[PDB]
Design a protein around this ligand. Structure first.
Ligand SMILES: CNc1nnc(C(C)C)c2cc(Nc3ccnc(N4CC[C@@H](O)[C@@H](F)C4)n3)ncc12
Length: 309
């Protein structure tokens, strides 16, 4: 289900982010000279000749091209010339981690709890398609509007065979602080280790983007986990939200909740959000509406199109 397009049909407008793996641009799809110009995000591979880097972005593209759900990001297209470029939905905002750090002062309990529900729904969808994401984290959730988020960043995701429970991973670099103990010790990943990561992701959100285990080095993490230490109760959480988090980090992976249970439990809480999260100044916090997000987008496109002239 890869739609392979010509590189010449895309103009890059602006850089939205860059890391060691590559660059994300805001681009325009221009298939007909000057008559159609449609905004898109383009992720471009830096190391065009590296077989390992090509492997990684193509695996990402494959997983991303086989998903279709409102709480999950999908691949619109690919270009395969001298390098690889993934063509993706352009969001007005970046990742949720950056979002919660920047907009801390106006984020209320209803938003935090809707985000929990939406990520669980997105993960439930992925589990139903046999996908183990293996890198769920607040930095890997995108903001489409403040009311609507989506799971992305499928570079590490694996498609389990029918009825198979586990993915046994090779060696390499891994995000220790989001991983289940069995993943650290034995390199085993499942939907229930994805549940462990989900609990860390909730904890990032409830702390408005604190780094987990801040101070403790990565190589110390499995030791402290085996000793029974876990991420601390965020200040805004009542015990009922923190217990859900703590259930996600139990040693027995089958004693962890399921994504479907997490959708039901967070839905219930979202029905009366201020009982479950205690935020000061909750009732007078303003976040942009969906129509504001379109305004912001039209505004940004106006100045960027003036810049290209
Ligand atoms: C201010 N606007 C923006 N800013 N940053 C990003 C990235 C850098 C998070 C954006 C990303 C996107 N669109 C998509 C859609 C689906 N997947 C992504 N990727 C997934 C893989 C990651 O490598 C990153 F490219 C985020 N981006 N739209 C807008 C962005």
């Amino acid at each position: 289900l890869l739609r392979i397009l010509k590189e010449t049909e895309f103009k890059k407008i602006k850089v939205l982010g860059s890391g060691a793996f590559g660059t994300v641009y805001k681009g325009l799809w221009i298939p007909e000279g000057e008559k159609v110009k449609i905004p898109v995000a383009i992720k471009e591979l830096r190391e065009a000749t590296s077989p390992k880097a090509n492997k990684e972005i193509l695996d990402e593209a494959y997983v991303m091209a086989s998903v279709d759900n409102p709480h999950v990001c999908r691949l619109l297209g690919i270009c395969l010339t001298s390098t690889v470029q993934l063509i993706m939905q352009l969001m007005p905002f970046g990742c949720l981690l950056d979002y919660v750090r920047e907009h801390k002062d106006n984020i209320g309990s209803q938003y935090l709890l809707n985000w929990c529900v939406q990520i669980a729904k997105g993960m439930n969808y992925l589990e139903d398609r046999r996908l183990v994401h293996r890198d769920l984290a607040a930095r890997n959730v995108l903001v489409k509007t403040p009311q609507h988020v989506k799971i992305t960043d499928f570079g590490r995701a694996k498609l389990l065979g029918a009825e198979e429970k586990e993915y046994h991973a090779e060696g390499g670099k891994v995000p220790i602080k989001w991983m289940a103990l069995e993943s650290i010790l034995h390199r085993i990943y499942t939907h229930q280790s994805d549940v462990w990561s989900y609990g860390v992701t909730v904890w990032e959100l409830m702390t408005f983007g604190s780094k987990p285990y801040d101070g403790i080095p990565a190589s110390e993490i499995s030791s402290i986990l085996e000793k029974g230490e876990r991420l601390p109760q965020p200040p805004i959480c009542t015990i009922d939200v923190y217990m859900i988090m703590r259930k996600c980090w139990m040693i027995d992976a089958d004693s962890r909740p399921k994504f479907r249970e997490l959708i039901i439990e967070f839905s219930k809480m979202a029905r009366d959000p201020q009982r479950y999260l205690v935020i000061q100044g909750d009732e007078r916090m303003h976040l942009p509406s969906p129509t504001d997000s379109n305004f912001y987008r039209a505004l940004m496109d106006e100045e960027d199109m003036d810049d290209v002239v």
